[PDB]
Scaffold this active site. Sequence first.
Site, PDB file in Angstrom:
ATOM      1  N   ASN B 112       0.799  -1.204   0.000  1.00  0.00           N
ATOM      2  CA  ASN B 112       0.000   0.000   0.000  1.00  0.00           C
ATOM      3  C   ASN B 112       0.838   1.262   0.000  1.00  0.00           C
ATOM      4  O   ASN B 112       0.327   2.335  -0.311  1.00  0.00           O
ATOM      5  CB  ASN B 112      -0.955  -0.005   1.186  1.00  0.00           C
ATOM      6  CG  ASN B 112      -0.243  -0.007   2.516  1.00  0.00           C
ATOM      7  OD1 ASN B 112       0.649  -0.859   2.764  1.00  0.00           O
ATOM      8  ND2 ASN B 112      -0.625   0.915   3.389  1.00  0.00           N
ATOM      9  N   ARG B 209      -8.616   1.291   8.688  1.00  0.00           N
ATOM     10  CA  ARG B 209      -7.610   2.018   7.933  1.00  0.00           C
ATOM     11  C   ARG B 209      -8.208   3.106   7.067  1.00  0.00           C
ATOM     12  O   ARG B 209      -7.521   4.067   6.722  1.00  0.00           O
ATOM     13  CB  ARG B 209      -6.821   1.071   7.033  1.00  0.00           C
ATOM     14  CG  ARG B 209      -6.215  -0.103   7.761  1.00  0.00           C
ATOM     15  CD  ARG B 209      -4.818  -0.359   7.289  1.00  0.00           C
ATOM     16  NE  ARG B 209      -4.295  -1.581   7.885  1.00  0.00           N
ATOM     17  CZ  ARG B 209      -3.001  -1.843   8.048  1.00  0.00           C
ATOM     18  NH1 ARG B 209      -2.095  -0.954   7.661  1.00  0.00           N
ATOM     19  NH2 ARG B 209      -2.614  -2.993   8.586  1.00  0.00           N
TER      20      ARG B 209
HETATM   21  C1  LIG Z   1      -1.633   4.514   6.600  1.00  0.00           C
HETATM   22  C2  LIG Z   1      -2.786   4.635   7.372  1.00  0.00           C
HETATM   23  C3  LIG Z   1      -3.540   3.397   7.855  1.00  0.00           C
HETATM   24  O1  LIG Z   1      -2.753   2.220   7.654  1.00  0.00           O
HETATM   25  C4  LIG Z   1      -3.826   3.601   9.344  1.00  0.00           C
HETATM   26  O2  LIG Z   1      -4.533   2.457   9.847  1.00  0.00           O
HETATM   27  C5  LIG Z   1      -4.873   2.606  11.228  1.00  0.00           C
HETATM   28  C6  LIG Z   1      -5.377   1.279  11.798  1.00  0.00           C
HETATM   29  C7  LIG Z   1      -4.065   0.542  12.094  1.00  0.00           C
HETATM   30  C8  LIG Z   1      -2.991   1.599  11.820  1.00  0.00           C
HETATM   31  C9  LIG Z   1      -1.908   1.596  12.694  1.00  0.00           C
HETATM   32  C10 LIG Z   1      -0.989   0.556  12.759  1.00  0.00           C
HETATM   33  C11 LIG Z   1       0.180   0.638  13.744  1.00  0.00           C
HETATM   34  C12 LIG Z   1       1.047  -0.614  13.593  1.00  0.00           C
HETATM   35  C13 LIG Z   1       1.032   1.897  13.554  1.00  0.00           C
HETATM   36  C14 LIG Z   1       2.105   1.852  14.643  1.00  0.00           C
HETATM   37  C15 LIG Z   1       2.806   3.204  14.763  1.00  0.00           C
HETATM   38  C16 LIG Z   1       4.163   3.311  15.460  1.00  0.00           C
HETATM   39  C17 LIG Z   1       2.236   4.338  14.189  1.00  0.00           C
HETATM   40  C18 LIG Z   1       1.041   4.292  13.486  1.00  0.00           C
HETATM   41  O3  LIG Z   1       1.378   4.398  12.096  1.00  0.00           O
HETATM   42  C19 LIG Z   1       0.273   4.552  11.191  1.00  0.00           C
HETATM   43  C20 LIG Z   1       0.792   4.844   9.779  1.00  0.00           C
HETATM   44  C21 LIG Z   1       1.747   3.745   9.305  1.00  0.00           C
HETATM   45  C22 LIG Z   1       2.166   4.012   7.859  1.00  0.00           C
HETATM   46  O4  LIG Z   1       2.898   3.717  10.155  1.00  0.00           O
HETATM   47  C23 LIG Z   1       1.028   2.395   9.378  1.00  0.00           C
HETATM   48  O5  LIG Z   1       0.202   2.148   8.472  1.00  0.00           O
HETATM   49  O6  LIG Z   1       1.311   1.640  10.333  1.00  0.00           O
HETATM   50  C24 LIG Z   1      -0.607   5.741  11.582  1.00  0.00           C
HETATM   51  C25 LIG Z   1      -1.043   5.618  13.041  1.00  0.00           C
HETATM   52  C26 LIG Z   1       0.198   5.494  13.923  1.00  0.00           C
HETATM   53  O7  LIG Z   1      -0.215   5.282  15.274  1.00  0.00           O
HETATM   54  O8  LIG Z   1       0.283   3.106  13.760  1.00  0.00           O
HETATM   55  O9  LIG Z   1      -3.702   2.830  12.014  1.00  0.00           O
HETATM   56  C27 LIG Z   1      -5.821   3.789  11.419  1.00  0.00           C
HETATM   57  C28 LIG Z   1      -5.107   5.047  10.920  1.00  0.00           C
HETATM   58  C29 LIG Z   1      -4.635   4.881   9.472  1.00  0.00           C
HETATM   59  O10 LIG Z   1      -3.830   6.017   9.109  1.00  0.00           O
HETATM   60  C30 LIG Z   1      -3.336   6.007   7.756  1.00  0.00           C
HETATM   61  C31 LIG Z   1      -4.445   6.386   6.771  1.00  0.00           C
HETATM   62  O11 LIG Z   1      -5.084   7.584   7.215  1.00  0.00           O
HETATM   63  C32 LIG Z   1      -3.879   6.560   5.359  1.00  0.00           C
HETATM   64  C33 LIG Z   1      -4.954   7.002   4.361  1.00  0.00           C
HETATM   65  C34 LIG Z   1      -6.238   6.183   4.517  1.00  0.00           C
HETATM   66  C35 LIG Z   1      -4.442   6.909   2.920  1.00  0.00           C
HETATM   67  O12 LIG Z   1      -5.478   7.346   2.028  1.00  0.00           O
HETATM   68  C36 LIG Z   1      -5.101   7.277   0.648  1.00  0.00           C
HETATM   69  C37 LIG Z   1      -3.864   8.135   0.374  1.00  0.00           C
HETATM   70  C38 LIG Z   1      -2.721   7.706   1.293  1.00  0.00           C
HETATM   71  C39 LIG Z   1      -3.204   7.789   2.742  1.00  0.00           C
HETATM   72  C40 LIG Z   1      -3.522   9.239   3.114  1.00  0.00           C
HETATM   73  O13 LIG Z   1      -4.822   5.923   0.278  1.00  0.00           O
HETATM   74  C41 LIG Z   1      -5.942   5.068   0.560  1.00  0.00           C
HETATM   75  C42 LIG Z   1      -7.163   5.488  -0.263  1.00  0.00           C
HETATM   76  C43 LIG Z   1      -7.508   6.948   0.032  1.00  0.00           C
HETATM   77  C44 LIG Z   1      -6.263   7.809  -0.194  1.00  0.00           C
HETATM   78  C45 LIG Z   1      -6.546   9.268   0.167  1.00  0.00           C
HETATM   79 MN   LIG Z   2       0.853  -2.005   4.420  1.00  0.00          MN
HETATM   80 MN   LIG Z   3       3.192  -1.562   6.392  1.00  0.00          MN
END
Ligand SMILES: C=C1[C@@H](O)[C@@H]2O[C@]3(CC[C@H](/C=C/[C@@H](C)[C@@H]4CC(C)=C[C@@]5(O[C@H](C[C@@](C)(O)C(=O)O)CC[C@H]5O)O4)O3)CC[C@H]2O[C@@H]1[C@@H](O)C[C@H](C)[C@H]1O[C@@]2(CC[C@H]1C)OCCC[C@H]2C
Ligand SMILES: [Mn+2]
Ligand SMILES: [Mn+2]
Lengths: 581, 288
Positions: B112, B209
Amino acid sequence: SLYPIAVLIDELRNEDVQLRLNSIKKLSTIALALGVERTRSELLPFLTDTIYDEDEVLLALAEQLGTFTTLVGGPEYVHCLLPPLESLATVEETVVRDKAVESLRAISHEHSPSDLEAHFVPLVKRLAGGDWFTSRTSACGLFSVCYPRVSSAVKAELRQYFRNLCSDDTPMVRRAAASKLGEFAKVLELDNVKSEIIPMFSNLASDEQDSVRLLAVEACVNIAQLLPQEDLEALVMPTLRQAAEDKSWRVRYMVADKFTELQKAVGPEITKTDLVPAFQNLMKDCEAEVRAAASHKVKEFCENLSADCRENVIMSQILPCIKELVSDANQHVKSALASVIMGLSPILGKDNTIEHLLPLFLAQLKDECPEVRLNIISNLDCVNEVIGIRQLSQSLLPAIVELAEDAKWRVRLAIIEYMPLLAGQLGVEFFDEKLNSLCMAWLVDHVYAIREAATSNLKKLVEKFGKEWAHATIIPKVLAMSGDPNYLHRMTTLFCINVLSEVCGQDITTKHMLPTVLRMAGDPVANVRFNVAKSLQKIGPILDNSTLQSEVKPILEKLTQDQDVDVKYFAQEALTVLSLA
Amino acid sequence: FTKELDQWIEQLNECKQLSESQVKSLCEKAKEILTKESNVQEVRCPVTVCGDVHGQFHDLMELFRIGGKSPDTNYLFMGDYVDRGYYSVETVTLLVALKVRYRERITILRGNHESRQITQVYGFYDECLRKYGNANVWKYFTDLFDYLPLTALVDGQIFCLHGGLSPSIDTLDHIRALDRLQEVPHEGPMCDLLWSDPDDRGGWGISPRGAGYTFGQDISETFNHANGLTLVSRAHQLVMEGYNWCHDRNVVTIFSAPNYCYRCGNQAAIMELDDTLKYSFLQFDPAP
Ligand SMILES: C=C1[C@@H](O)[C@@H]2O[C@]3(CC[C@H](/C=C/[C@@H](C)[C@@H]4CC(C)=C[C@@]5(O[C@H](C[C@@](C)(O)C(=O)O)CC[C@H]5O)O4)O3)CC[C@H]2O[C@@H]1[C@@H](O)C[C@H](C)[C@H]1O[C@@]2(CC[C@H]1C)OCCC[C@H]2C
Ligand SMILES: [Mn+2]
Ligand SMILES: [Mn+2]
């Protein structure tokens, strides 16, 4: 400038009357050109004042002058060599002042007793009673050679100047006097050692400057040997006991450093009385430098205790302190101890070692500091030649087998690197029955780095037991892996053949490894296949030419027709390197 | 050119980035190679399957210390090479460099994060700036990521992909039918394959997510049975133990970035599929 002397000069540079380096060394020859009379009348004088700062030269000139006695007229004229040497003595770069002195000491013996008094001693004074300092730093090294041979009256004079040198206002002219007090002591009559040396010694031991005090420890060893045992307690021990207590750890450090020498110089009785307690204090010193210095001396010290009280002071005075040190904070200290602690076995016996040392032996074999368990592992020969290989294997083997199989690889990797050591020490018979199993097991470990470690570990093992031992004890089990269903293991086989060809010799490789290598050219997995090309490129140079052409060339050529890109590429590469392409 | 790739790799192994110049080259050739590959790339065992790396270059080196050096050991990475870690540039370039030099020894899927918008929020974009002074190296790589195969089929039994299952895809044929040569969409099959997560709630659920969905065991069993699969192998989710089984073992998660973001304290794992598709896991901590 003029010939023949002018040959020494270097007319091609831009100096200040500089000499040819490759020439000052060919000096005995110019001396031979003009005669002995002219060597004195013109060569020496020219050398005396023509003292630039070309150091590589000054050095040679100083050295060369110590073997010129005879080219100057023999003994009767040996003193013509003094002037240029006196000069070279007061130079800068110590290296030169040293050679100057070494030579002056050398030719001192050439001077006749009468000439010593007339020319030499006078040179000693002018250097001692000289203004500049280096001129004195070097006067100190010239008293012992002339003292024995001059008159009773001059002996006195020499003593006085040496004194004045010990009480010099400059710390250096004092550190120097101190480090030469011992040798001077050895050439005086007992009387004067008691009446003159002792006071100088006492004074230097209580010097305001500790850089001077720490040096009197070394002097104490010398003075202590020269004196009869009963005189020690009155004239020396108070001073020595004070040194081990000195405010400056540097002075204490020197006491722990010269401990074994003091032991001998002082005698068994005083060693049991005064030195055993001193040693215990030093092992408990606040500064880790001192504790470490002491710990280092543990084995040598106990070794020298009077046969009669030995084993007792050890189990009662020394051993309890050692249990303490195995737990010290500083790895600097645990370090020093481990590199000698197991050397106590042949001084406590099979029974004592088994009951009191083997435990400390294990407390360290499982210490954090890697250097510490390594020091213990590097010295098993003595504990082993004392208690039985079984009684040892019974107290060491579980330690090893427990680590060879552990949580973290790395911790395992560490035990793999003890093998060539354990091997070389405990013997091939022990290794074939308690260690070979472990070394084979690692070849098939889950972690790659471990497999890799154990692979090259075989080469180190063959270097310890030989190509025959390999063909019998290791090649058979290594080859057995070629039948393994997992390609990670089959490749491990070729990796072991690559390393073992380096030390198994042309015969054993061609007969017992090459076949298995060529046989895998048809392995079902591409990774094994191209690694076969690579293995042939690796061992190809060890095989004689007839083999390389009859059996290798064909196999590679076939591999170049393989379906797989990489087998093809590596096959070609192998041909090109071996020159079979 | 081959002697060159070998040097580029020797360099990257010392953690020294390649030049804007070379990256542009490496990427053009990587595209050539990656275009010919399928949306459900066929991968024959033996091969070691790896999960997320996220620029944790030194942990990647720890991964090779444990599974063997390429090209001796075959590898299948399930995407997520950049962002979060401190060395996104070195990491992704080493991997792409391994792919161009050894097409048959390494397989790289798209995660992703191998996309344009997310890389400007979580690292990669800015790291490229700090290291090349301009966005070119980033454009060369994000353009390349459009060619990354979405999934891999190992021995026609083990289905691997970065994220997970989609409610709009029930057969491997449906996936082969997508056009993957484009940025990752915010909705749909391609998106879901890279964003979804297995769950312990049945059926389909709302993904926390904000992209893709959650899917329970029931959905996996159906997907597996309908496709003659013994297992679904994915990553995308931090798993403390390094790897994790779920859905009565129809699904396995493999995370390869130990101590994620340098703060999670999780182990990392890689999965070894031998000559017989027999699997074994190797867990490891961050390299010292
Ligand atoms: C990445 C993510 C998700 O994957 C993440 O999914 C959640 C659930 C589980 C996850 C956290 C996992 C843990 C393990 C980590 C551990 C640590 C230490 C940090 C932390 O890291 C996360 C980001 C990242 C990287 O490190 C990861 O994916 O683990 C963010 C939250 C942090 O606490 O969580 O969070 C909720 C928050 C969410 O946010 C971002 C999300 O908005 C991204 C959006 C949704 C995307 O839209 C777009 C563009 C790119 C991007 C903005 O493309 C998708 C289609 C629409 C389009 C606009
Ligand atoms: Mn991933
Ligand atoms: Mn990853």
